[PDB]
Symmetry: D2
Subunit: 235 residues, 4 copies
């Protein structure tokens, strides 16, 4: 009725598995034409099979977000064949890590903005990292990137707002993915002891939110980091 993204071309990066794939399908299912990407050809192929499998119009694709060449090429390629994407979704020593992420977020976001600017409409949606038990160190990085995301996101939202382009972030919590499904029994129950709802979040649950923010309904929402974590907040 009104959660229709019909006739809108979405771009989901890192969409071969878990959260990213869940975002891809959810966007399609809301009528989006959907371009999922991965770092490899094998990956990009897989994505397409999965789209066709669920009736979603679109295309798998190979993209290295760290490399300008890839980005410039990928977009150019996308534009000609499918159209210009207006819903763009970024999915993916603490210093190096965080520094690299935000530069990428930047690189890509910058690239896609020319297109959103012409159309005077856009959605950028940035996905946080999942919580993962690498100990004391795990707590440091999680918080560090989550801090970067929040800040970054809000800044970029301020810089584009005049052109009716929202920018928002989603901060997953302890999510049921391939990564989590094989962590030690201890670090699981310890961590569930910290989540008020007492379960992991399913990828779909992230997707749904992503889908929301994409919608026209959530058009006065910009610069915001929606926490999806069943109540476990870390700061």
């Amino acid at each position: 009725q009104s959660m229709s993204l019909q006739g809108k071309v979405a771009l989901v990066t890192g969409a071969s598995r878990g959260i990213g794939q869940a975002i891809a399908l959810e966007l399609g299912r809301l009528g989006a034409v959907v371009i999922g990407t991965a770092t490899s050809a094998s990956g990009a192929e897989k994505i397409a099979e999965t789209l066709k499998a669920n009736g979603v119009e679109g295309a798998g694709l190979v993209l290295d977000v760290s490399s300008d060449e890839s980005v410039a090429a990928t977009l150019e390629h996308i534009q000609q064949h499918l159209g210009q994407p207006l819903i763009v979704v970024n999915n993916a020593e603490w210093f190096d890590v965080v520094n690299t992420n935000l530069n990428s977020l930047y690189r890509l976001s910058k690239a896609v903005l020319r297109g959103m600017t012409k159309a005077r409409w856009g959605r950028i949606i940035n996905i946080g990292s999942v919580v993962g038990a690498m100990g004391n160190a795990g707590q440091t990085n999680y918080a560090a990137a989550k801090a970067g995301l929040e800040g970054f996101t809000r800044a970029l939202a301020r810089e584009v707002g005049s052109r009716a382009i929202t920018v928002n972030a989603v901060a997953p919590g302890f999510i049921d993915t391939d990564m989590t499904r094989e962590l030690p029994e201890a670090q699981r129950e310890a961590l569930l002891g910290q989540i008020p709802l007492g379960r992991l979040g399913q990828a779909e649950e992230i997707a749904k939110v992503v889908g929301f923010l994409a919608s026209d309904g959530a058009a006065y929402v910009t610069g915001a980091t929606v926490p999806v974590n069943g109540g476990m907040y870390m700061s």
Copy 2:
């Protein structure tokens, strides 16, 4: 028999302060997602108006009189609601020195009501509590103080209540409106508007519906791993 799947069909929502603007927009948006909807006001004139508006938009439900500050109103209102319609599981709560009294009163009320409706959500092992912030309400620096002060209370309160309740699959979330198209704003000087819109990255006021849509979202089953959160709806203008 009716027997639905993807939206709020067969769920009884309660929206407080639903006669005007933001609250009414929430009421309709819930109805439109199939909710059976109980809007309330502080007066009979108000409660009657709400019902007219529901019928007008085909929404099943009832206008109702409720004083959130007074325990017995609350106890009575819920009791009434339960028997006739059912138990609500989606419940939606809608110059400086003032700031303490204002904020104190709100949270006590938020508490009172929330407590009341929880007995029901607990039996059903499912719920949604959704708390609406105040709108940016004056200019001045005093406006800045109160706005921030309630927005701070809401954020904190919301998150706390989410923590004491989460076991029972009941989300608690808040929505923080920005500068929203209202009576207050509709009659301001031609300067203080554009100055203020120079403050909002998106360059416009938020329509009530825009708040509603988010409310509606959080209500949905999709947004079931979202709890204790305060979603800012403000077109980019952030204040503390």
Copy 3:
């Protein structure tokens, strides 16, 4: 001796953190009025002041009760003078937090008449130290917000309002918790130790100082790196 000729009021100063604040203020030349909820307490405070050469007075005060507050201040004023450094350090989560802030309000309101005349003041609010996680965060949220609001409402009159947020502090309650739950918890504090009460005091003392006069509405976290929300 940098708060010389300034009359400080420290609530809940018989033990641990509050007492540490009391002494630290005295030591910076403050005339110091410590309070407790009982006569036995108030007596003790005075002994301790004398013991450390600090001019001032122990006193009985129920912060929840307007009568006490109005009376206590009146009493203080006549005998010692008007306090301009005032330091608040005296299911369940809502009641708890609600009560605290109302008290913070009550008292703060009371002492402001005095600071306003003098066009100078310090209000310093001290934070508390599964369910434990909920309340800790809940009051800490209230304190931060409350503090900042009140700072906005008084600023014109050169009165700072600030908060201090203790972490895991070495006090009576903590010093005897199980050997396991200590090391587990120290594994969460980056600095690897508990905070001594004095460490809070030193900050309190700082904020009191004229140096920290452009610092208002702020909540200084004293927690050795362990941050929680």
Copy 4:
């Protein structure tokens, strides 16, 4: 009583003017041996004159924080002559991304460098100074760097804490500096109408806080960003 910084060697970057200089003197005044730096020889010479002038033992110095060579050289130079600095103070503050990215890398570079020394001594202070507010785009950057500082500062505090080294940030507000002191009379009163205390902050007022954090008293304070702004808070 007695609580100063005697026998401790402090390093203040960008200490020729305003806030940085105020920090330099305040540290000296608390007995610190003090090494102020600037980007030029003219600057570095001036700093020394000012130290002598106020009886403070130490040295002016030339340092480009963006360039590894400078940093490695400067520290080496400092160490053999004066000693190893254990109080280190970083003073500094479309294009919001580049700006903030550059700052934090620098904060990183230097902080890393000086940590070898603090680690040997099992004691340290790192103190990071935020940028001053200037009165739209100003709002974006101010918030953006203030966000980076807060986050960065915390993270680094988490990574060094075991070694009894605090890391803290100070967030100046609208401060009376040469930069601010020549803005229009209108935009002054308008802005003071936004600061609860109704005045600008003097550099010294920052310094005093810096001095505090340096002290042994503020040793259980780490990862924190102390706001010095007379009540005007922005995000």
